[PDB]
Every structure is written in structure tokens, then in C-alpha cells.
Symmetry: C3
Subunit: 490 residues, 3 copies
Amino acid sequence: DQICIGYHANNSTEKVDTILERNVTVTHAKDILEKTHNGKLCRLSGIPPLELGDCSIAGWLLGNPECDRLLSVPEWSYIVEKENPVNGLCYPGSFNDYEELKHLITSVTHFEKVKILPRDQWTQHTTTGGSRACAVLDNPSFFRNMVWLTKKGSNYPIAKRSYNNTSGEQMLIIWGIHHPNDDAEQRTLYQNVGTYVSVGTSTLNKRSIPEIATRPKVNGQGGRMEFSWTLLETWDVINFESTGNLIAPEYGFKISKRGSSGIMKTEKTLENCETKCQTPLGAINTTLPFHNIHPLTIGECPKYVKSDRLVLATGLRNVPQGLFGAIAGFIEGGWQGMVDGWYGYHHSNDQGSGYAADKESTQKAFDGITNKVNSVIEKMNTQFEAVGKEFSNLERRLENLNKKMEDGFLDVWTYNAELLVLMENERTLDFHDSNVKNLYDKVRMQLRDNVKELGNGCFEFYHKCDDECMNSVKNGTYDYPKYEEESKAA
Amino acid sequence: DQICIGYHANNSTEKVDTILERNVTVTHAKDILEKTHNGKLCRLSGIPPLELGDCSIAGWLLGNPECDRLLSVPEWSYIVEKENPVNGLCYPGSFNDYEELKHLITSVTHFEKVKILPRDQWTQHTTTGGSRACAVLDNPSFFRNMVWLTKKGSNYPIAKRSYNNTSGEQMLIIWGIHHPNDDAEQRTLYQNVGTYVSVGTSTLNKRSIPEIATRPKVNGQGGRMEFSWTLLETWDVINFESTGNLIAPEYGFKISKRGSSGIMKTEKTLENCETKCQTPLGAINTTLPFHNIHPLTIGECPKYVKSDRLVLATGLRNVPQIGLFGAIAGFIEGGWQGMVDGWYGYHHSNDQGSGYAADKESTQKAFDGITNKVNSVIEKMNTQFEAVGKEFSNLERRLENLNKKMEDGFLDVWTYNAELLVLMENERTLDFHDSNVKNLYDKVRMQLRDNVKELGNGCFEFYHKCDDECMNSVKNGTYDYPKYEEESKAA
Amino acid sequence: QICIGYHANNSTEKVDTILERNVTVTHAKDILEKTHNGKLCRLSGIPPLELGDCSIAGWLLGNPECDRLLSVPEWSYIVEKENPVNGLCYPGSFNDYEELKHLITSVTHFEKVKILPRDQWTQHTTTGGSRACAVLDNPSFFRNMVWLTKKGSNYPIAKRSYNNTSGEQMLIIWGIHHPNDDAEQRTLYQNVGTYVSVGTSTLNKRSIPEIATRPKVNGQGGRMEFSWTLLETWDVINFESTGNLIAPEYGFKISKRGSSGIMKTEKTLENCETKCQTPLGAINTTLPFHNIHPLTIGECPKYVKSDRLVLATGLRNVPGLFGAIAGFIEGGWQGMVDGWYGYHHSNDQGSGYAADKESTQKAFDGITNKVNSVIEKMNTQFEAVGKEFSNLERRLENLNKKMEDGFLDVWTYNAELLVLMENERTLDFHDSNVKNLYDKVRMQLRDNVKELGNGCFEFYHKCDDECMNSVKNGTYDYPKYEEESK
């Protein structure tokens, strides 16, 4: 007649690491590192991104002919370009504060193209000018949203037009100045040398002057076009005033913003799809606190880490057949044959044997570990972020500062997440150990001298312990006085 | 005759969370999150802030008439402004590298006004030019620290004046150029069309041409004034020259810096108050490592976190009566209301009485231990002076965003780590108490050996008479086993 | 009889734990690196560029004072004196200077070339110089640059170009001269309303000279404004000017792996090797933290605001959660040298100490994993902490400071607390190891022995060396000696 304290073992091969040990096999585990995505570009919190594919934001906004037909949703949650768009400034040049502009339209309400300065109303200038650099099929053309003002006959009178933003929303307006190859070209196109482009609003005062230099051809053009932009407040007016070289907008873009986002550089396309965390490889749908998919995410995302593996122990050390000496200790092996709990008893008497899980201690352990896992996951704070940024090539220092920052956080999170898992895994194994030792002690303190401590977690009865008796032990209501007399001999 | 091991219980309903459990009731606890402030704007380490009220820094430095009766201390540790200052560039315009200027004077020594270019000495120019965009009461007026040079009679001769910085300190100097709305304006003000403004020091070299162009009226003006600034070094000279459109300074500002600070946007005004950590809602007075009061602080501050609650268990699990080591709420089913003199102790019964006594040794151990734990979590926090809030122009959104992403970054790190630290430390504090009771019980057991019987929940029944002196020797670990058998009673 | 016990020694090593301060332990491991070699070293095989008291502009422009500089063709970082003495001897400025410096902190390789031989400026005077760049002490000039001035009394259009056929991107610098007055303009350039224009396939620029009275610097009221571009392979740069152009005669072939930084120090290269350099000396450590100096370059440990980070490895030195060590087993044993935990026995045959190498070995393996967990998990990517910002970039500089201070705070705190937490666990781990040992014997002997309460067991039967051995290894035969008669 004997009763034994034991613990669960199974066919698990799942390993974890702890602070003190490596590759420990445990009965149950849970990975808290998200490693999978759906390989798709999705809508973010219900809003699609703006898809530019081959074109750059400049090529699109200016209306580079290979871009001016782009579809264009009225509202988007982020922007998807390719790494290096083929179609941008068809006519070569530069764009002032181009990155700031990109950052501005990265997420919008609301965005709508509007005709603000009908091109036919430049009655004193020629308006049909174009370039072979922007040729189609294959006549010379030009940015579709813009107007190249040149002299009419031999005259370029001052060009003065204004527009009042009665639209109802702030309006993005873009304009440019042309820098010819030489003075002769300057005289041919604008008749006068020594000209200026002047743009003014309530908040903006900008003047550019043509800068003529000898340049290698780009897209077959030695000339350059330099563009600028502003936000025109509602009910405000913008005044264009130029004696030559102005590249005027014919259109403006109504814009409302909801906050900011980012550009995501990928070769993928939108699908009928919903996510809260987008990566260039696909979308993440996860509750886990960490992922290792891609650094450049957009949305409310888990923390990116370097690790390939973050597995928490939930079950106990799997010993098919610690701090507290019981598990894989004086109770040297686990019972492959206890399926109904983590800890329990095996009993032998005239009636049989023997496996019975302790429901309470098991229930307490499940609660405990459930809280552990939930602690590590739920306490992670998450807010919307767009990780990737645009910097120009005279902003390497700024780019580098942003890189050091993202690297510093990567280091902090990777280090802490690894050690957290190592520490908690250690303590989890010991938690189970403790639970078993306490179960073993409940039985001991009940039996005392009415049984012998057989070692290996077994108790040898000095009396006849029937099934009902065994149950009284298993439920902590064993009747010691009843089995005095019939004890050893006494 | 018996002696029982036990542990403190009390009235507390104070709750903590651990890694394994939520809302555990403990006898004592300490909040390590600072949640309160004094609702005052205060001096920062002895030094007051500069108060600007409704004026922006530009308005104040240029001397917008609405700002020209303003305090201005000899020295400040930060700048207080209202969220959107009413008074700035009264005549419409702009200010080059304005954010840098603002950052520069965020905290000064020492800040002294000097009349470097007395206006009355522009003898070949009209100097009393004013505008309705700066109307005083309610006559035309102008920035009181600046001089609008305009034609005298029908003439605007070349204007050349210079100044040597013999102030013995770096000097902040501001100047402007006027961009008229039209040629008639250029002509009225400066006679000549085709003018220039030129400014030169040892390190600064700048020449600008006025931009005449039609613009929407702001404060009734199509024109704009564009201001720039430089620091004139000790003993260096600044040369002004203009055939028109120069907005000259009459004053410069001797400036000495002892580090940088920031600007705090609030409606509060300075009070006779001292703090090391200021927020827009009021000052924080604390040694605690974390706070949740406001993100935009100035001073030496606790780490800001996104939690409502960070409570460390100090006492033990409160189990008043009518764990890893299995004693507390375990084989010793409950605690003792009646033991006030310690955390763990004994109850003894014998012929002479009974019998609560705190075990002094293990109680002291526990007090020292928990005291060190709390002190570890609090003292190890490195805290240096910072001004969270920053100024970025409307064309520095990427930069502003970089700043936001950084603060959010440390916010997430500190919040996650603080929440987890507490959960983990509370877990171990409960187990420490549990262990302490378990060890105390074992201490008695190992002394008594078979001179006593283990009775259940923490109690020993002696097989021999144990009077108060015997109890004492047990309580202080000098029990005398060989003396007490009489363990013929054991059989 | 037989007693369980643990190692003690003559250590005075002190560690702190979350619960306790100044605990003496048998052994401990410092994880904070505090020493450097006091030398300036090569970085993974490659030396720094050493500029003495010449600034980078002074060097690239060819300030006469910088002639005996002698560069290298490849370098891993740049060493500059805290405050260079030789920069723009002719007063002026340098557009996007800091971006230039950042671009050349680390190259492979670098080579000056004569892209625009000055002999070929046949329609201009090229001998112009200034007492501001005086050599010995006659007027001189930046040696890589060419001050063009009127020839006789004519300054024909200056028109030259260059095609980068050198096979490498080429750094090219030019300047414009802003004279002090009109007399100076005419003396130098004849013409008055002149320009300098520069063009490549990406660069477009036309500058007008600013003539204005300024304070004398190095005796000059005039100023030279320099700008730079990176010319692509097979691209062309075109200079055109009617005056005021300060032209390059040379360009610099440049290839970059990645970026580094500039170290300010007085020290000079000393023929050592390192993978982590501070301005005080190089660091050679496997440890995860260091407190030598903030501004490092290379693959460095995390820098922290800490004087001491000592990890306990051994046990409390006694010449805990489990109550064994410094508990019911009052003291350690000097005499037990082979292990952390063990036995002492008293016999008819003798005594005494025997290390239990199983539990010791399991412990050594455990602590070793802990230590190397703390160390190896640390990331160490190459980096250059120090950064250059101009005097109108204070906000950006302060933003960078805020970031460094941020990580420092995080790392200092986590490192301090990590050490305190792990140390309390280490001590309790040893305590538990002793307790389980004592219980291993107790649960074996059972009825056949007396538990004294000081770690000792007193046999109710004779226990010879062999019996003792079965106890010391968990094969003790309880039935064999069961003859009670206690």
C-alpha cells in the first residue's frame, strides 16, 4: 500500500533557455516572438495606401506624362513607392524641401486636384512650350499640371496672376523657375536677361533668380528646372509675379491631414486586405510584443528585435521515464501516464492503481503562468509609428542620427527581451519545482508516522489504505487518528 | 506546553500585482510613481524663468509696442510663454534661424540691453517712421528697439554706421530688410529704386536686395520685413550699409550662457516657489524614479511613463484571521492581528502565560532587506537636467518627427521596464517573506528535534515542561536539547 | 557522523544585491571595463588620418601651414586637435562643411589628382595671393586652389571643364571672392558685375560676389566662400566666370565603405591595434559595459555612468531564501578546496572533507551560463559617437545629446539593477544547492540517524569509509543498517 507524488511528462521536444541552462526540454512552451506575416500590402485601419509604383511623388504632382494618369484615391493612410522610381523629373532639375513635402502628404483626409489658374488666361505669354525630355509618342510635351511661360513674339511682359483659396481646405501649390544653358537661350525664351520669379502669400515670400551654367545633358537637356511648394491657407491669396523664367502651376491640391505616416518602399501592390501593422514584406496580425520581420514598419507594431527565437516556458521540465530539489531531483522522473494535470498522485492498493492529478495545485499553476504570459504581452505599450524616413544627400548627418537612434532601440529591446525570457524561464521551472515540493509536503505532514518516507516521492502505508482512504489523502482530509493502532506495529 | 511560529497581519486593503497574481492584498506597500504636483510655476534651482506672457521672443526682442513694458530678469533658467503668443511681428514678415535664436536664449547668465546705435545719430535720415500695423494709442508706431530708416526730404543718402563690441561680452544683434509691396511704396519710403542692405562682421557677411512684389495684406500691409541676427564677438565690429530698406537696430543684447534649457507653453505665472522639476501644470517635488504628470518637463525629472500605478509590496501578503515556500497562507494558514511588534514571531503557551513575541532577528533582516530593495529601485535612477519641449519650424517636420519618435521610444522602454520591474520585485518580495517564515519555523524545529512534536500550522508541542526561560532560549536560538528528556513522555 | 557544508576562503570581494549591500563572496566577476591602453591605435588594421592642428578645410584647400601634413591613402577615422589652428587663412566660409567632414571620416581610398593644371589658365593671372596666407612672409595662397585675376587689364571669360575619367567619385572644391570694395574688385578683376557658375549633371550654381566693407581678419576685409561637390564617374564639371572665381587645380578620388567619425585629442598614432578607440586610449575587453569615455569609435561596450558592476559567481564567504548558508550551517570550511559544496565525516577510520563534485559541477555550469548570458547577449555594432554640428545647428546638436543621455540613463539603470537582481539570485542558488545536498542525505538516512541541526547527522549504526561513500553518492542501503536499536 503506497501513494506517490509525481508530475507530467509528454512527447514534447520543445526547448527553451534559462539563465542557468541551455536547450531545456519542456512539456509546454509559447513563442512570444512574431515571425510571420501575410505577404500582402493591406489597408491600414480601413484606409488604403496611395500606390505610386514606378513614379515619384514629384513626377506625379507635377504631372510627368508617365505619371499624370495615375489612379489616385481621395484618401490614403500611407504611401508605397519603389526604391528608385523610374519616372520623376522628366525635365531634369531639383525640388526644394522635397522630403518635407513627401512627409506632408504621407497621410491625408482628403486630397483633391483643382484647376486654379486656367492656362489659357496667360493672354500675354506663350504657353504651349514643351520639351523632348517629356516626349510621349513622341512629340515634345511637359509636366501636365504646369505651364511653361515663354515670350510672345519678341515680348515677355511681366506675368502677374493671383488665386484666392476659396476651396474650403488648405491647398498645396507648386511652382518652378527655369535655368537655361546660356544667355542666348535666356533671351530666346524670355527675351530679357536679369529676371525673377516671385511668389507671395500671407506667410510665404519667395524670390528666385535664374542661375545659368554650362551643364552636361540629363535626359538630353542641359537646362534645369527648380521647383518649390507652399501650403495656401483657406481664404488666403497667392501672388505670382515674374519677369521671366516662371514655371506656373495650373493646378493646386486641396488637402486635409489626420496626422502623419511614412513612405514604404516595396514592389508589392494593395490587396483586399486589412491590417494594423504593415511591413515591406507583408502585414502583421499579432498580439505578441516582439517581431523580427522587418525594421521599416508602419502602424501600431510590436517591437522589432534581432533574435530569431523568444520562447517562454509554460509547462515544466519534460523528463520522460531546480531550486526545490523535487523535479528531476528526489522524484527523478515524470509520469508519461498522467494526462489530467501537471502534478498528482499514483497509488497502489488491493483495489488497484493509480494515476490521479491534483486539480487544485494544477489550477493554481495554470492561473499563475497565464498571468506571467499575459504580463509580458499586455504591458507592452504600442502607438502608431512609421519607422522609415526620407533624407537628401546633404543630410547624411541627420540620416545617421536617425540610424543610431533606431540601432540604439534595437539593442535595448533585443538585450532586454532575451534576458527577460532567460530569467522568467528559470523562475518558471522553479515555480513548478516548488509546486511539486509543496504537494509532497501536504502528503507528508498529513501522514507523519502512519507511513514511511520511501524516498523518490513515495509513501509506504503502515495500514490498509483503500480507495476512499487514498482520496482523503489526495484532498487533504486524511484521518490520522483513525489509523493509529495498525502503525508499524503500534 | 507549546510554541507557535507566525507572521504579522493587519487592516490593510492595499493591493499589488505580481508576475503570477493580480490584486494581492499586502500589509504595507510603497508607490514609486509620482502623481502629484503643486500647481505652481516655480524657480528652477534658485533661478526664475523669463516670463513673456502674450509676447513671442521675436516680439520681445524687436520691441513690438505690446511687449515694450515687460519685466526681463538679469538671469533665467527657462522661458515661459503662452501657447500661441498674440504679439510678435506686428509689421508682417519673417525671422531667419528663429528657432536657433530661441534655443540660444533659452537660459542665460546675465542678459543685458545696450544702446549700440542711438537712433538720433542717423542725421541724414528720417527715423520716426511708423505704421498702423503697430499702432499704439492709436497712432502709427514701430518696433521700439529698431529704426525704420526712410528718406529725409526727397533724399535717402547712403546709410553707413558701425559698432565695436566693447561690452566685454558676446552681443546679440538683430536687423531687418523691408520688402515693399510695390514701386510706389519703394519710392515713397526710400526715394531710390534699386537698393541693398549690407551687414558685416568678422564672421558674418550678408548682402540682400529688397523684393518688391504684390502680396496679400497682413495687418494691412502688402510689404514684409525679414529679420536676421548674429552674435557679435567681444571687440569685433559690425558694419551696416544701405542705399535703402534697412531696418536697423538701436540696441544689442550682451548675452552669457551657462547651458541650455527650453520654452514652456502655459498660462500659469511665476510664484514664490522652488523646484528642481517643472511641468506646465505645476512643479514636481519627489525622489521617486517615475512620474506620469506631463511629458513636457524642464529640470532634473523622474522618468515619464504611461502608467497610472506602480506599487511595490513592502509588507507581506495580508492574511488576517477570525507561495513558493508554502508557509504564508500555507501550512501556517493565517497571520496574526495581535503581533504588532514585528513581521514574524512566536506564540507560546505554558503554565506561566502566553504569549506573543516578535522574532527580532528575522524582523530586522526583513526590514533592512526591503529597505534596500526600495532604495535600489529608487537610488540607481540616474537623473540629469533636460528640457523636453523643442521648437521646430513648419519646414522641419521630419526633424520634429524624429524628436517625437525618440521620446516615444524612451517612453515605451521606461514604461514596459517599470511595469515589469514592479511585477517581478513584488513576486520576489512575497516569496522573501514566505521564506523568512519558513526559515523561522525550521529554526525552531531543528533546535527542538524530537523533544517536541510537529502539531500542524506552525505549532510545536513540547514533550517536556518549557517555562518562560526555556521559551526564551528557543526564541533566541539557544535551546538546550540534551537537558530536556524527560522525552520518556515521547514514549 | 557526517556533516554537510560549503566552501569558504580568504576573499574580500564585495558585491551588492537588491536586498543587501557589501556582501563578501568567495569569487566574483567585474563586468564593467575601466582600463584603456593610453594609446591611439589602428582600427581593424587601418590607421587614422592625422591632421595635427590643421582643420579639414585647411587640409583640403592646401593651407600653406599644412604642407608637412602627409596623408594616408586609406583611413578608418580622423584625429584632429580640439581646436585646429590652421583652417581658412584667407577669411571666409565653407558651405555644408560638416556634411563634407562626415563624408570623409572613413575612406578607401583617397588620392589627390591634378584635374585642372593651372598652367592652362593662359588668359588670366594665376599668381594671386595674400599676406593672410603669408609664407615667410610673402603673400601666398591655398596651394590646391587658384586665385584667377585680370591679365594686364583684362579678365576674359574664364571657361574650363573636367571629365571624371579617373574611375572614382571625385571630391571637388571651389570658391568665390567677396571683395571689400569696388576698388578691390576692379584692381583684381577689371569687370564689376561678375558671376561664378558651376554645373554638372546634378549640380547647378551661379554666385554673385558681395562687395561690402567688413572688419579685417588676418588683415583682409574681403572673404572667400567655398563650396564642394562630389563628381560622379564619367560626369563633367563646367566652371564659367567673369571674375571672382577661386578655382580648384586638384580633385580627390574617394571610395567609401561606411562612415566613421572625428576624434579630438592631442595623442598621435602609436602602432597598436584596437577595435574600440577613446580619446584617452584604446579598449580591449570582452565585457559588456565600460565607463572610460563617452566619445568612442569602433566596436565598443555600452557606456554607463557606473563605477562598479560586479557580479557574484561564488557563494557568500563565511569563514538566504533556503536557510542553509550562514543559517543552520553557521560557517564555511577553509579545508574544502575541491568544491563549493561537500561533506565532512568522522569515522573509526578517520576524517574528513570530501567535495561533492556533482552539485559543484552543476553549479559551475549554471553560473557560467549566467555570466556569459549577461555578456554575450550584448550587441556591439561599429559606431562613432562624436558628431559635428555648426553654430546654427544647436537644436540638432542638442537633439543628439538628448539621445545619448537617453540611452546612457536606460543602460546605466538596467545594468545596475540587472547586477543587483542576478546577485541575489546567485547567492540563493548556492544556498539552494547546499540545502538540496543536506536533504539528499537526510532523506536517505531517515530513521538510521540523528539530525543535529548544524548540518550534521549522527549515525545510529557504525558507518565505515565504504558506507560513507554510499551516502556521499546516493546509494546508501537503509535496510542494511535498519537494525534500529537507537
